[PDB]
Design an enzyme around this catalytic site. Structure first.
Site, PDB file in Angstrom:
ATOM      1  N   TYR A 256      -3.275   9.444  -1.142  1.00 23.50           N
ATOM      2  CA  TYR A 256      -1.984   9.824  -0.657  1.00 23.50           C
ATOM      3  C   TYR A 256      -0.954   9.851  -1.746  1.00 23.50           C
ATOM      4  CZ  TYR A 256      -3.987   9.266   3.890  1.00 23.50           C
ATOM      5  OH  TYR A 256      -4.825   9.370   4.943  1.00 23.50           O
TER       6      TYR A 256
ATOM      7  N   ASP B 250      -9.033   4.893  14.603  1.00 21.01           N
ATOM      8  CA  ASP B 250      -9.902   3.818  15.057  1.00 21.01           C
ATOM      9  C   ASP B 250      -8.985   2.939  15.890  1.00 21.01           C
ATOM     10  OD1 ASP B 250     -11.366   1.336  15.308  1.00 21.01           O
ATOM     11  OD2 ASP B 250     -11.705   1.189  13.199  1.00 21.01           O
TER      12      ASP B 250
ATOM     13  N   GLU C 229       0.784  -1.212   0.000  1.00 20.09           N
ATOM     14  CA  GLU C 229       0.000   0.000   0.000  1.00 20.09           C
ATOM     15  C   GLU C 229       0.816   1.261   0.000  1.00 20.09           C
ATOM     16  OE1 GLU C 229      -1.741   1.044   3.849  1.00 20.09           O
ATOM     17  OE2 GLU C 229      -3.377   1.410   2.463  1.00 20.09           O
TER      18      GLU C 229
ATOM     19  N   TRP D  75      -8.398  -0.571  -0.593  1.00 19.01           N
ATOM     20  CA  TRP D  75      -8.969   0.592  -1.273  1.00 19.01           C
ATOM     21  C   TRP D  75     -10.208   0.515  -2.147  1.00 19.01           C
ATOM     22  CZ3 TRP D  75      -8.272   5.463  -0.063  1.00 19.01           C
ATOM     23  CH2 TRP D  75      -7.252   5.660   0.842  1.00 19.01           C
TER      24      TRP D  75
ATOM     25  N   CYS E 203      -6.596  10.929   6.734  1.00 18.94           N
ATOM     26  CA  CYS E 203      -6.731  10.803   8.184  1.00 18.94           C
ATOM     27  C   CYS E 203      -5.360  11.020   8.823  1.00 18.94           C
ATOM     28  CB  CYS E 203      -7.243   9.429   8.554  1.00 18.94           C
ATOM     29  SG  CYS E 203      -9.008   8.964   8.587  1.00 18.94           S
TER      30      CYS E 203
ATOM     31  N   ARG F  19      -5.714  12.559  12.625  1.00 18.54           N
ATOM     32  CA  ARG F  19      -6.714  13.472  13.094  1.00 18.54           C
ATOM     33  C   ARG F  19      -7.806  12.686  13.708  1.00 18.54           C
ATOM     34  NH1 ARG F  19     -11.349  13.430   8.999  1.00 18.54           N
ATOM     35  NH2 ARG F  19     -10.349  11.461   8.625  1.00 18.54           N
TER      36      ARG F  19
END
Ligand SMILES: Nc1nc(=O)c2c([nH]1)N=C[C@@H]1CN(c3ccc(C(=O)N[C@@H](CCC(=O)O)C(=O)O)cc3)CN21
Ligand SMILES: Nc1nc(=O)c2c([nH]1)N=C[C@@H]1CN(c3ccc(C(=O)N[C@@H](CCC(=O)O)C(=O)O)cc3)CN21
Ligand SMILES: O=c1ccn([C@@H]2C[C@H](O)[C@@H](COP(=O)(O)O)O2)c(=O)[nH]1
Ligand SMILES: O=c1ccn([C@@H]2C[C@H](O)[C@@H](COP(=O)(O)O)O2)c(=O)[nH]1
EC number: 2.1.1.45
Lengths: 316, 316
Positions: free
Chosen positions: A146, A221, A60, A82, A198, A218
């Site tokens: 990203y 989980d 990834e 994704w 995130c 930010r």
């Protein structure tokens, strides 16, 4: 042990976190503000208490560092983390015109019309994307992920600036500056996005030797999510490190809304139940040196044995 | 006491921080990564151990929240914290054509041609800016400062988006979201800037009641610098708070390169020497309610008594 800042932060969401609604109404125990530290020469920071997958993370990040925004590389490797916003575009398109995929996403687990149809429609969307060299481009290509945030942030006056390319320069030339940041929050794009980034910002540091890094996630989980994110940037930190010439030092993970899910309560209680076995060792291909050229084979993992993996039910 | 996270972080740069060169070769004791917390209902977070100025901070932030990028408001109030990049443009201009101001900046303290000339040239640049309604616009208007980063980030396709305007909406409507961020790092603009923003990102939180906030200052000067910055966002937090309807909770200050200066050693040793007197109380004008309309008179400070102020020599 190397991974005890994650445990000490899961027993801290759990009984010290307060009940937050959140968006997809399944509640949280939020906290706001947490710095946890990882010194990466003691060993590598993924969990031995609960199986975490390393070829997924590898493929990834490897994918994010090519600036590639296409699932077709990810599928080629066997990664489909994704998939679902891609399909969010395909089944909301003009070309979809078939067997209804509306909300696939949480109509799944709730069986009915959804367990084998949303799932037959997924291998149909993937396979097309692995082969039709145009299908791949209209729907399999995500635009803002990203890799473009990182290496082709779109400017205000017409083009592509590679942030991480320049920061790997500024470490290579001006090691000790308090500006070594790559940023993913772009606000043109925030109001009209699927999930805004995130892992919002991150800054490197050159201690004397030893590159370090601090992240600002930010939203986080706990149980699902934070095992993964701690390792991606321990790899980024670990990969940038080997290209500047510097030893590896430490990765600081800083969070804003760190929250454990209300599903994930028993499963995280289950996890804490156990003892850290010794932290894993990672080695890197030392003959390759330009990191953006890293085939999969070039990053490695020397003895890792977790426990048991764990089921948390379907997040979002 | 309310201010002990600053002390516990100054005796931690001092003897635990390592010697960093830095850019303007006067060395640091850096550390990388520090979260310090402030719960703002115990009282207000500026220091009683060392006089910090509150009408300066007020006027400055007040200035940033109008999106105003002009020193002419700041001068009107009596604030000149911002003066020297302005002059960096004036004395590097086409119109300057007089008595040489090259490097004013650290030729000062080193007397010679510089203590009364760079200083006569400053009241000459200011006064012009307070009155010539055009001089004001060509040189007194900074372009990229926190008011435009904050409330008129320039988009990739031709105009002004007010970030903080929308975030004060998203708190007013969706209190509990893990996206409530305002961002100052824009990379179009970073490679060609005077000082890129030092308080790079910040995110609000709505606990249940109680707005909180986390900052990510990237670069922090301890002794000079971090007394100031802890209060600006305790005021921002405190001002946004009163406009959403919510109580005030807590402000988290997160740093990347927190460093004490090698000048500031004796002066910070001097500071630690003393005892916290009780934290100050701030009240807000409760009839005004839209914060962007706050005259100076509307934010207040109920008993503050520091010690002694302190001299650190000329930073940069
Ligand atoms: N905006 C956003 N930011 C992210 O942090 C993020 C994101 N979405 N989601 C997609 C990618 C890749 N990342 C992810 C996403 C999901 C898992 C995931 O499914 N991992 C869980 C296990 C779930 C299971 O039990 O099946 C875990 O335990 O961490 C991992 C990494 C982050 N990235
Ligand atoms: N890029 C940048 N970011 C900032 O954090 C910043 C900045 N520059 N410098 C200008 C403004 C306003 N801020 C400032 C700047 C300087 C002082 C200052 O002179 N305060 C010192 C005392 C210096 C003295 O002893 O005269 C202190 O103790 O904090 C305060 C706030 C931040 N802002
Ligand atoms: O792989 C990921 C994906 C998401 N998140 C988080 C936590 C939340 O469940 C989710 C949504 O939060 P907001 O969209 O409200 O920011 O983002 C992670 O920690 N890791
Ligand atoms: O009022 C301010 C201004 C600057 N800084 C800092 C600390 C450094 O001395 C200065 C320069 O760092 P870089 O430009 O290398 O980021 O930024 C603060 O903490 N507060």
């Amino acid at each position: 042990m190397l991974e005890q800042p994650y445990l000490d932060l899961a027993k801290k969401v759990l009984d010290e976190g307060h009940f937050k609604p959140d968006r997809t109404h399944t509640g949280t125990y939020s906290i706001f503000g947490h710095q946890m530290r990882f010194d990466l020469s003691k060993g590598f920071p993924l969990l031995t208490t609960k199986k975490v997958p390393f070829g997924l993370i590898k493929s990834e990040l490897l994918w994010f560092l090519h600036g590639d925004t296409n699932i077709r590389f990810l599928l080629q490797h066997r990664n489909h983390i994704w998939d679902e916003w891609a399909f969010e575009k395909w089944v909301k398109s003009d070309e979809y015109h078939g067997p209804d995929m509306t909300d696939f996403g949480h109509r799944s687990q709730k069986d009915p019309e959804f367990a084998a149809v949303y799932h037959e429609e997924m291998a149909k969307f993937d396979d097309r994307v692995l082969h039709d060299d145009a299908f791949a481009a209209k729907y399999g290509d995500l635009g803002l992920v990203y890799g473009s945030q990182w290496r082709a942030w779109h400017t205000s006056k017409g083009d592509t600036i590679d942030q991480l390319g320049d920061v790997i320069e500024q470490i290579k030339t001006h090691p000790y500056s308090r500006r070594l940041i790559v940023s993913a929050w772009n606000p043109e794009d925030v109001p009209t996005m699927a999930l805004p980034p995130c892992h919002t910002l991150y800054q490197f540091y050159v201690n004397d030797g030893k590159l370090s890094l601090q992240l600002y996630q930010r939203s986080a989980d706990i149980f699902l999510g934070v095992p993964f994110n701690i390792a991606s940037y321990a790899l980024l930190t670990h990969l940038v490190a080997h290209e500047c010439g510097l030893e590896v030092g430490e990765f600081i993970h800083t969070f804003g809304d760190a929250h454990l899910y209300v599903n994930h309560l028993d499963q995280i209680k289950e996890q804490l139940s156990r003892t850290p076995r010794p932290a894993p060792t990672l080695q890197l291909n030392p003959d390759k040196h330009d990191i953006f050229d890293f085939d999969m084979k070039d990053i490695k993992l020397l003895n890792y044995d977790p426990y048991p993996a764990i089921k948390a039910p379907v997040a979002v």
